[PDB]
Amino acid sequence: PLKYSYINKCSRFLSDDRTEVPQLVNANQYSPCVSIVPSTVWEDGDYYR
Amino acid sequence: YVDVGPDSVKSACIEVDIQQTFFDKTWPRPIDVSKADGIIYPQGRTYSNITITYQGLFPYQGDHGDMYVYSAGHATGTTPQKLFVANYSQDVKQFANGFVVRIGAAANSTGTVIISPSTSATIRKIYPAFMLGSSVGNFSDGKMGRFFNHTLVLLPDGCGTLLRAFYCILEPRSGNHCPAGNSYTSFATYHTPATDCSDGNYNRNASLNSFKEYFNLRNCTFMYTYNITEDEILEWFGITQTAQGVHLFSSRYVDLYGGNMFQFATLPVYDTIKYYSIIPHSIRSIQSDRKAWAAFYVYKLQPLTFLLDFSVDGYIRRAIDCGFNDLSQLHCSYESFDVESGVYSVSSFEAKPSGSVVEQAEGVECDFSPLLSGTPPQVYNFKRLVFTNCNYNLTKLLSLFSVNDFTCSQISPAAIASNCYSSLILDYFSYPLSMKSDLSVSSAGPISQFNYKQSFSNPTCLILATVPHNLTTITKPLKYSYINKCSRFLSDDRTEVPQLVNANQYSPCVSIVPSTVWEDGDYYRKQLSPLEGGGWLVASGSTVAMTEQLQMGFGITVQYGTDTNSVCPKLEFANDTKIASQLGNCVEYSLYGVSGRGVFQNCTAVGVRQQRFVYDAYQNLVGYYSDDGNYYCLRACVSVPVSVIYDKETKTHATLFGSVACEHISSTMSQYSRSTRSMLKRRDSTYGPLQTPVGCVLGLVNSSLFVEDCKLPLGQSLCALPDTPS
Ligand SMILES: *[C@@H]1O[C@H](CO)[C@@H](O[C@@H]2O[C@H](CO)[C@@H](O)[C@H](O)[C@H]2NC(C)=O)[C@H](O)[C@H]1NC(C)=O
Ligand SMILES: *[C@@H]1O[C@H](CO)[C@@H](O[C@@H]2O[C@H](CO)[C@@H](O)[C@H](O)[C@H]2NC(C)=O)[C@H](O)[C@H]1NC(C)=O
Ligand SMILES: *[C@@H]1O[C@H](CO)[C@@H](O[C@@H]2O[C@H](CO)[C@@H](O)[C@H](O)[C@H]2NC(C)=O)[C@H](O)[C@H]1NC(C)=O
Ligand SMILES: *[C@@H]1O[C@H](CO)[C@@H](O)[C@H](O)[C@H]1NC(C)=O
Ligand SMILES: *[C@@H]1O[C@H](CO)[C@@H](O)[C@H](O)[C@H]1NC(C)=O
Ligand SMILES: *[C@@H]1O[C@H](CO)[C@@H](O)[C@H](O)[C@H]1NC(C)=O
Ligand SMILES: *[C@@H]1O[C@H](CO)[C@@H](O)[C@H](O)[C@H]1NC(C)=O
Ligand SMILES: *[C@@H]1O[C@H](CO)[C@@H](O)[C@H](O)[C@H]1NC(C)=O
Numbered sequence: 001p002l003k004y005s006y007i008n009k010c011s012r013f014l015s016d017d018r019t020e021v022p023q024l025v026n027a028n029q030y031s032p033c034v035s036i037v038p039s040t041v042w043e044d045g046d047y048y049r
Numbered sequence: 050y051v052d053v054g055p056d057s058v059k060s061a062c063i064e065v066d067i068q069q070t071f072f073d074k075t076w077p078r079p080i081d082v083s084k085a086d087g088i089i090y091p092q093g094r095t096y097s098n099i100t101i102t103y104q105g106l107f108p109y110q111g112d113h114g115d116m117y118v119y120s121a122g123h124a125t126g127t128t129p130q131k132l133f134v135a136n137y138s139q140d141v142k143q144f145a146n147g148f149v150v151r152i153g154a155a156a157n158s159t160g161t162v163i164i165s166p167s168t169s170a171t172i173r174k175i176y177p178a179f180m181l182g183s184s185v186g187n188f189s190d191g192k193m194g195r196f197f198n199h200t201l202v203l204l205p206d207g208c209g210t211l212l213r214a215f216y217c218i219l220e221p222r223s224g225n226h227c228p229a230g231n232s233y234t235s236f237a238t239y240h241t242p243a244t245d246c247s248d249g250n251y252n253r254n255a256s257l258n259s260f261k262e263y264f265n266l267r268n269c270t271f272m273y274t275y276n277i278t279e280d281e282i283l284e285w286f287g288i289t290q291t292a293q294g295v296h297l298f299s300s301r302y303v304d305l306y307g308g309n310m311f312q313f314a315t316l317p318v319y320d321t322i323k324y325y326s327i328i329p330h331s332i333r334s335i336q337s338d339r340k341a342w343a344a345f346y347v348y349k350l351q352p353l354t355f356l357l358d359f360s361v362d363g364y365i366r367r368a369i370d371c372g373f374n375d376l377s378q379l380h381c382s383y384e385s386f387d388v389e390s391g392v393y394s395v396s397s398f399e400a401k402p403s404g405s406v407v408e409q410a411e412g413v414e415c416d417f418s419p420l421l422s423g424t425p426p427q428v429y430n431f432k433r434l435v436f437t438n439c440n441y442n443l444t445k446l447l448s449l450f451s452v453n454d455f456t457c458s459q460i461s462p463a464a465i466a467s468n469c470y471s472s473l474i475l476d477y478f479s480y481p482l483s484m485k486s487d488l489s490v491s492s493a494g495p496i497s498q499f500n501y502k503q504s505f506s507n508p509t510c511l512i513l514a515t516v517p518h519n520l521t522t523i524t525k526p527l528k529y530s531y532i533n534k535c536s537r538f539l540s541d542d543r544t545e546v547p548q549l550v551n552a553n554q555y556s557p558c559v560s561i562v563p564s565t566v567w568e569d570g571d572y573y574r575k576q577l578s579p580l581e582g583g584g585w586l587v588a589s590g591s592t593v594a595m596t597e598q599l600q601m602g603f604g605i606t607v608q609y610g611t612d613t614n615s616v617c618p619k620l621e622f623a624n625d626t627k628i629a630s631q632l633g634n635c636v637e638y639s640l641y642g643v644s645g646r647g648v649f650q651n652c653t654a655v656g657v658r659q660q661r662f663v664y665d666a667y668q669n670l671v672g673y674y675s676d677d678g679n680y681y682c683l684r685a686c687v688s689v690p691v692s693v694i695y696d697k698e699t700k701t702h703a704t705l706f707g708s709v710a711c712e713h714i715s716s717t718m719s720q721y722s723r724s725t726r727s728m729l730k731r732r733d734s735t736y737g738p739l740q741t742p743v744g745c746v747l748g749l750v751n752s753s754l755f756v757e758d759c760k761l762p763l764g765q766s767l768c769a770l771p772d773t774p775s
Contacts, residue, residue, distance in 0.1 A: 030320075035184075
């Protein structure tokens with residue numbers, strides 16, 4: 001790999017802009033956040049929405 | 050990737066006319082669980098004629114299902130015309146641990162054409178097509194049900210003797226009446242019997258090719274096909290998903306007559322299915338040659354348990370949904386299809402919960418009142434109020450001024466009012482509207498340069514507003530003023546260094562400038578001490594004439610706590626139901642973090658007053674002192690015991706609700722203890738509840754007979770006679 005990478009956060013913001021919902025990965029399932037994250041993380045601490 | 054073969058050449062498609070009102074029919078098909086309808090055979094094991102309980106995914110016994118009907122497209126004369134179809138393409142459904150379907154149940158019977166139902170054509174079995182996947186969304190025309198990434202496709206091809214499965218990315222087509230086109234209506238597929246399904250040459254690719262006309266296949270990663278032969282007999286099919294991937298089940302491979310499902314096939318795809326839909330299809334047959342099609346049904350799987358009556362030949366012949374009604378529960382408790390007659394206990398009604406009641410301290414108030422009196426400061430002299438741990442309504446605060454500028458950075462102006470923060474800070478000053486072009490955190494104006502600045506480390510806002518004629522305690526400066534210069538001369542008396550104002554801070558030059566600037570262009574200087582490195586402070590200012598109503602500006606900043614966000618826009622039931630109390634039923638509650646569900650009632654006052662929570666020796670809350678100064682008592686809530694009378698000889702039943710009495714009894718129940726009460730209704734649809742000394746009953750009948758032993762006594766002098774023998 002160009003760099004080894006991982007997702008160190010996965011949550012969804014609540015529509016009211018005051019709270020946030022965490023999303024731990026389910027056993028034997030891809031995290032939902034994979035739909036936005038790039039095939040590699042371009043820089044450490046990158047975040048996406 | 051998979052060798053699917055070439056994309057069809059035309060980008061063009063047949064237009065799809067939606068005729069969905071023609072498909073409204075009422076032909077429900079509830080599951081006959083006693084016939085083992087829809088039962089999936091257990092995995093990897095078989096049994097003797099012994100009855101066993103079992104747990105697995107199954108349909109509810111009472112579900113009538115979802116019904117769909119395929120039909121011929123429009124045709125006239127001797128040729129095909131634009132399609133007439135059901136709007137089923139819009140039926141996005143949430144996937145829910147699989148489903149099963151019923152196919153061909155209407156075989157060897159007649160019905161109507163539906164799209165042209167006056168023909169009353171006989172009906173024949175047709176195989177359904179489906180799409181499954183992890184996401185759905187709008188078509189470029191805003192149409193429902195477009196799918197993303199890769200999806201499952203199940204399509205029969207040509208005649209039902211061939212079946213294919215796919216995992217690919219669909220690609221839209223820009224041709225007329227196709228998905229990237231703006232002439233698109235709805236996706237559909239079709240079969241053309243004129244050449245399709247020739248007796249010596251069935252068209253194995255027929256359905257797929259008509260599918261290709263609306264979507265180009267892309268990146269197919271899986272394809273499968275299956276060998277099927279014609280048989281008008283009813284068949285069962287279904288889908289489940291596991292960490293081992295998707296599995297397919299059918300009754301056709303093993304049990305053509307009993308209908309038990311078996312796992313016919315499995316699929317490598319383990320990608321989670323989040324959505325489900327039926328793919329529409331139509332027949333291109335000649336108008337006089339149109340044929341009506343058999344009804345088609347769908348049912349949903351659930352994590353239920355059942356009695357299973359295995360036959361000695363290992364087929365399941367009968368089953369009991371344990372949760373369907375009280376009697377079914379009784380059968381499950383004895384693992385049998387024949388419980389001995391008696392009176393039996395059944396689970397109690399859990400009652401019903403009402404809307405919540407909560408009491409918590411209130412009256413926070415954010416001390417914002419200083420803004421309403423005296424003369425506001427010149428913009429370089431702005432006054433600040435810091436607020437933490439407190440309750441506010443900034444939209445109420447801002448209704449005290451007419452706002453001529455409501456803007457913010459890194460927060461919408463509406464959101465900062467509704468957002469909770471660890472702190473709320475407000476700056477205020479007089480400010481003429483004539484200077485409004487110069488008030489931004491990004492402004493080129495002298496106000497941002499020397500008078501007021503806000504940090505970009507926090508969301509901030511700027512407000513311009515003016516004073517109402519009814520705020521008479523507010524007064525105004527002789528002239529509006531600002532500093533238009535602030536620099537220090539370097540000690541060599543030639544070099545000079547500008548001093549732009551620091552974010553969230555007064556300019557250093559405020560120390561030399563007067564509380565207002567007496568005239569436009571006034572300037573001042575101060576010698577600086579050797580500790581300062583020498584030099585001179587220099588500053589100047591400018592003014593704007595006073596106005597009939599005071600004009601003002603404000604600054605707002607906030608800090609969001611990670612978990613310290615104690616400042617919030619709490620309201621004391623403004624725009625709300627006022628749920629501080631109910632008297633009463635059984636609605637959950639919270640009292641200063643104490644919580645439970647129960648009924649409150651107004652009662653006397655026990656001591657010690659102001660200890661708030663009265664408790665018994667078992668720590669049940671007994672009652673509570675409200676902040677309205679009244680004691681209320683709490684009885685939590687109560688439930689209704691139930692029992693049933695079972696007459697095994699006649700296989701009939703009746704029920705008793707015990708001590709609850711018939712004043713709380715109704716033909717249906719809102720509480721509820723089980724998924725249905727309809728078994729009682731089988732005869733009790735025609736009768737009112739009867740009160741007895743023990744309690745209210747259903748379907749008891751008042752015979753006023755005297756009998757020694759009824760073999761079903763209810764206790765007391767009550768007795769329960771069986772219907773007379775055949
Ligand atoms: C299968 O269940 C049947 C239930 O009928 C059992 O057959 C009964 O056996 C008892 C005593 O062995 C007889 O009194 C009944 O008359 C039988 N029933 C019938 C309908 O004849 C049987 O034992 C079970 N096992 C097998 C292998 O058949
Ligand atoms: C209508 O559908 C099929 C087709 O005729 C019938 O299924 C047959 O049932 C008999 C019963 O023993 C089987 O032996 C045949 O193999 C079945 N298939 C055929 C003839 O293709 C079904 O029973 C019919 N429905 C009725 C008569 O109500
Ligand atoms: C079972 O499936 C196989 C292939 O999976 C079938 O074999 C081919 O089927 C096509 C059907 O369009 C025919 O055109 C070919 O001539 C068949 N080839 C061979 C070598 O048989 C097969 O016909 C299916 N049915 C049975 C009963 O085996
Ligand atoms: C078409 O689908 C809609 C779903 O919104 C449904 O209301 C309507 O009854 C359908 N037409 C039928 C089933 O004939
Ligand atoms: C899956 O679909 C989403 C929908 O927006 C898209 O953004 C994403 O690129 C797709 N992923 C693929 C094709 O791998
Ligand atoms: C999907 O299809 C595109 C066609 O443009 C191809 O380039 C790509 O390699 C395919 N496979 C993926 C994204 O895994
Ligand atoms: C609630 O209790 C108090 C004290 O017992 C008494 O005024 C009355 O019963 C209730 N108050 C009402 C209904 O205003
Ligand atoms: C049942 O019959 C008895 C006969 O003595 C009568 O007194 C009683 O009121 C009846 N009750 C109901 C609920 O019909």
